[PDB]
Amino acid sequence: SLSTEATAKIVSEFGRDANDTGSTEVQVALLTAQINHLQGHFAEHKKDHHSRRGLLRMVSQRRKLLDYLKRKDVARYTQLIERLGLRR
Template sequence: HIKDHGSRRGLLKLVGHRRRLLDYLKRNNLSKYTQLIGDLGLRK
């Protein structure tokens, strides 16, 4: 719903959390990162 800012905020928080975890993984274990990206179908 266009005016449901609470849900949008929660979703953005989750996405940001995922983003930070993936950034960490990319820095520390690149092979695992690329495998995970492929498995989840992220980052075209």
């Protein structure tokens, strides 16, 4: 999901430019947008275990990228987590 327009908007909002789409901030922002989105899908489809497996893969991917960003540059890490609404 997370249609081309929404993901390109996140790319432009969170990256160097629209071509810069693989940077850690953009990857984390896209995973976070997808997770906030899918929270509604799993609000009622509680028994969608096969899709929640991919959701948890997204959560773990976002956490691994956040750890990388933290131990790579703490300033960008703090900026991204506060701009994205993270830490529990």
